[PDB]
Design an enzyme around this catalytic site. Structure first.
Site, PDB file in Angstrom:
ATOM      1  N   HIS A   1       0.801  -1.075   0.111  1.00  0.00           N
ATOM      2  CA  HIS A   1       0.109   0.255  -0.153  1.00  0.00           C
ATOM      3  C   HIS A   1       0.957   1.087  -0.028  1.00  0.00           C
ATOM      4  O   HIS A   1       0.650   2.217  -0.780  1.00  0.00           O
ATOM      5  CB  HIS A   1      -0.893  -0.136   1.249  1.00  0.00           C
ATOM      6  N   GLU A   2       1.762   1.259   0.961  1.00  0.00           N
ATOM      7  CA  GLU A   2       2.521   2.381   1.007  1.00  0.00           C
ATOM      8  C   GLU A   2       3.643   2.557  -0.032  1.00  0.00           C
ATOM      9  O   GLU A   2       4.425   3.584  -0.103  1.00  0.00           O
ATOM     10  CB  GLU A   2       3.480   2.492   2.255  1.00  0.00           C
TER      11      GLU A   2
ATOM     12  N   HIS B   1       2.444   4.533  -3.003  1.00  0.00           N
ATOM     13  CA  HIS B   1       2.316   6.253  -2.793  1.00  0.00           C
ATOM     14  C   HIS B   1       3.605   6.616  -3.397  1.00  0.00           C
ATOM     15  O   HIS B   1       3.775   7.800  -3.775  1.00  0.00           O
ATOM     16  CB  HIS B   1       2.073   6.424  -1.321  1.00  0.00           C
TER      17      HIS B   1
ATOM     18  N   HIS C   1       3.839   6.918  -6.911  1.00  0.00           N
ATOM     19  CA  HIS C   1       3.029   7.753  -7.131  1.00  0.00           C
ATOM     20  C   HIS C   1       3.710   9.220  -7.165  1.00  0.00           C
ATOM     21  O   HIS C   1       3.779  10.044  -7.696  1.00  0.00           O
ATOM     22  CB  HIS C   1       1.677   8.069  -6.397  1.00  0.00           C
TER      23      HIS C   1
ATOM     24  N   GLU D   1      -5.590   7.904  -2.529  1.00  0.00           N
ATOM     25  CA  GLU D   1      -5.442   6.691  -1.963  1.00  0.00           C
ATOM     26  C   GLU D   1      -5.749   5.508  -3.223  1.00  0.00           C
ATOM     27  O   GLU D   1      -5.796   4.373  -2.628  1.00  0.00           O
ATOM     28  CB  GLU D   1      -6.296   6.297  -0.610  1.00  0.00           C
TER      29      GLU D   1
ATOM     30  N   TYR E   1     -12.360   6.741   1.270  1.00  0.00           N
ATOM     31  CA  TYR E   1     -11.511   5.417   1.454  1.00  0.00           C
ATOM     32  C   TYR E   1     -12.337   4.509   0.729  1.00  0.00           C
ATOM     33  O   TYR E   1     -11.844   3.593   0.163  1.00  0.00           O
ATOM     34  CB  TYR E   1     -11.028   5.320   2.803  1.00  0.00           C
TER      35      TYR E   1
HETATM   36 ZN    ZN Z   1      -2.249   5.552   2.618  1.00  0.00          ZN
END
Ligand code: ZN
Ligand code: 0W2
EC number: 3.4.24.16
Length: 664
Positions: free
Chosen positions: A460-461, A464, A467, A489, A599
């Site tokens: 998940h991290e 980012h 991105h 997200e 979310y």
């Molecule tokens: Zn996040």
């Protein structure tokens, strides 16, 4: 050269408290001068060059220098350094409130929009213009000096209220005491960790690592009833009094700024646009999830009839609020039977790291390379340089901060440290991100090992991080992860889908004793458990979303009576008489009030892009992977979220893959 990394990171991580103090004083003084210079330019004399460009150039300079000042507070090992950094950040945020009310600078660029030709500059330069002006009108700089002075005062009180709301909850030290029998079915690990008192009982605090084991594991329902009552009466009457001031205050400031509700004020910068768009989205999703939640309540209830019969308990015939996390954890260990600890033996951290770096390099067309003699804020931190495989363009760098220590951020996060924007001298800045998580600390016995929900967080991290790094814009305001908040997200949640893929899990899993994979029965038990308790877990996110939306639409309602209303109408599990959950809801006084919907909003988009585009065309295909890199990640916040979406799906997105995710 945009084809080296040399000279392009000169961020200093060894600044003394004195150095942080003086760099903060010098940056404030220097940034203020630029604002001051612009705000006294005659309207006859303004240009794109001496208004909009000098503003953008100081914005980049501000952002990078600020990172050396406000980031030590989260990762440093020296307490005196974390304290200078906390004070710098407070002193710099004082400076930002001050700059947010600069009407002299605002007047200069309204004039520029009035005169100069909008079609002889770049589309992103047009965007920097229009959104800086929209920024100042959302602060009321176009309004009189009299409500502005009052709006200023009203906002300084919201600040005080929000500070005190969380300070109240953090200074709370409410504890219950129990015996070893009143703490049934809780491990010796948990009970040895507890303090003992003068009447020789076990002290259980109301903090998260104490509360949640008990609600999930304790076989005594009366212990659960006591802990839930204490948990949702924390700061009950004093945080209710704060919400009774804070929520009407948000309604009042917004109406002065020309917005119907505070939720409308917030949503204008979002991809969900309006409150009715959010409302229908949340309402037409509970009607979707209803029989699935009807099925889950039916099953959990029968677990309780079984359990109370065996253990010698009375059976009320409801699922109470102190009964839900218990029988959901039973459902996880009855239907789907994944030992989440013999599974964690298959994920050692050298292997998870190496094969996560392998997937993204192959998918997005990148080449990572660790920096040898690297400047770091800690010994345990690595540094990788990121290249494009075809050209050799150095896009950026990411640090990996993986293990917990004292003073460190105890949540998972991607910090942007440098924006991938243009520099004043025409040049391009290298992107710099930091992945900061707290995976279980390596102990000299075995390798450090990861649970599957830790692999899900790693993944998940890191989206980012991608991105942040793959993003390339002209202005710093649109650089990196600076997109809409109901869109931030999407690049994170979409890549969580990879840890629920069979082939991909094999790239991560390798037993730390020989190196034999997870077997086929265990891999299948795994990915079948993606939708355990989905209905009641998703209906509870909607409850909190309907709650956040309600208090910022009609501020004349009891927050606790709205929470009660949604808990029974949507969740089917009643709020407990005497409790006040919104008085413990830290998100309302965090920075993301009116934004909790985002979310579930973002999951729908990532489910669409995965099922309709990646699952279809091959999930490791480097043509969908480059199109995802170019039309979602690269433009940053320089395009709108739903435009970047439709450039990729080639159509307006729908909830179909989202409903087929959950299985409806
Ligand atoms: Zn996040
Ligand atoms: C709250 C503040 N608002 C304005 O300054 N509004 C003005 C007024 C209202 C409109 C129009 C005009 C520019 C901007 C937007 C005056 C703000 O966003 N700040 C504070 C300095 C810095 C900054 C922003 C924009 C340009 C340059 C800098 Cl150095 N920026 C900032 C702060 C922390 C992190 C990143 C940042 F970018």
């Amino acid at each position: 050269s945009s084809y080296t990394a040399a000279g392009r990171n000169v961020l200093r991580w060894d600044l003394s408290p004195e150095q942080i103090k003086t760099r903060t004083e010098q940056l404030i003084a220097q940034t203020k001068q630029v604002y001051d210079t612009v705000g006294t330019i005659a309207l006859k004399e303004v240009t794109y060059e001496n208004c909009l460009q000098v503003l953008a150039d100081i914005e980049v300079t501000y952002i990078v220098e600020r990172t050396m000042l406000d980031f030590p507070q989260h990762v440093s090992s020296d307490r005196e350094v974390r304290a200078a950094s906390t004070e710098a950040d407070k002193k710099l945020s004082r400076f930002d409130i001050e700059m947010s009310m600069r009407e002299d600078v605002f007047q200069r660029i309204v004039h520029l929009q009035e005169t100069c030709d909008l079609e002889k500059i770049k589309p992103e330069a047009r965007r920097y213009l229009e959104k800086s002006i929209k920024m100042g009108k959302r602060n009321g700089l176009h309004l009189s000096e009299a409500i502005r002075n009052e709006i200023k005062s009203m906002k300084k009180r919201m600040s005080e209220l929000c500070i005190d709301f969380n300070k109240n909850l953090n200074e709370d030290d409410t504890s219950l005491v129990f015996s070893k029998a009143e703490l049934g079915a809780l491990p010796d690990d948990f009970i040895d960790s507890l303090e003992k008192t003068d009447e020789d009982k076990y002290k259980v605090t109301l903090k998260y690592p104490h509360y949640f084991p008990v609600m999930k594991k304790c076989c005594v329902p009366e212990t659960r009833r006591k802990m839930e009552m204490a948990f949702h009466t924390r700061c009950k009457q004093e945080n209710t009094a704060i919400l009774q001031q804070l929520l009407p205050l948000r309604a009042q400031v917004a109406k002065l700024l020309g917005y119907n509700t505070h939720a409308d004020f917030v949503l204008e910068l979002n991809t969900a646009k309006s409150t009715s768009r959010v409302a229908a989205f949340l309402d037409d999703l509970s009607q979707k999830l209803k029989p699935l939640g009807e099925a889950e309540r039916e099953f959990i209830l029968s677990l309780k009839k079984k359990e109370c019969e065996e253990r010698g308990f009375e059976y009320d015939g409801k699922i109470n609020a102190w009964d839900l996390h218990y029988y959901m954890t039973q459902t996880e260990e009855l239907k789907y039977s994944v030992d989440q600890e013999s599974l964690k033996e298959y994920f050692p951290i050298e292997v998870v790291t190496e094969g996560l770096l392998s997937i993204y390099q192959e998918l997005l067309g990148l080449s990572f390379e660790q920096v040898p003699d690297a400047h770091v804020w800690n010994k345990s931190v690595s540094l990788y340089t990121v290249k494009d495989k075809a050209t050799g363009e150095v896009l950026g760098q990411f640090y990996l901060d993986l293990y917990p220590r004292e003073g460190k951020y105890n949540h998972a996060a991607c910090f942007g440290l440098q924006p991938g924007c243009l520099l004043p001298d025409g040049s391009r800045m290298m992107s710099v991100a930091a992945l900061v998580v707290n995976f279980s600390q390596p102990v000299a016995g075995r390798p450090s090992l990861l649970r599957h929900d830790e692999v899900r967080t790693y993944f998940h991290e890191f989206g980012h991080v991608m991105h942040q790094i793959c993003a390339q814009t002209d202005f710093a305001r649109f650089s990196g992860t600076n997109v809409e908040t109901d869109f931030v997200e999407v690049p994170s949640q979409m890549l969580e889908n990879w840890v629920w893929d069979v082939d991909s899990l094999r790239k991560l899993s390798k037993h730390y004793k020989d190196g034999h994979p997870i077997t086929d029965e265990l891999l299948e038990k795994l990915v079948a458990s993606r939708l355990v308790n989905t209905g009641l877990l998703t209906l509870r996110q909607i409850v909190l979303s309907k709650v956040d939306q309600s208090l910022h639409t009609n501020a004349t309602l009891d927050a606790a009576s709205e929470y009660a209303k949604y808990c029974t109408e949507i969740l089917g599990v009643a709020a407990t008489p005497g409790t006040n959950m919104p008085a413990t809801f830290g998100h309302l006084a965090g920075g993301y009030d009116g934004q909790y919907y985002g979310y579930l909003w973002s999951e729908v988009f990532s489910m669409d892009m995965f099922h309709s585009c990646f699952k279809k065309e091959g999930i490791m295909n480097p043509e969908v992977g480059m199109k995802y890199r170019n039309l979602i990640l690269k433009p940053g916040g320089s395009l709108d979220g739903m435009d970047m979406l439709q450039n990729f799906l080639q159509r307006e997105p729908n909830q179909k893959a989202f409903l087929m995710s959950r299985g409806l």
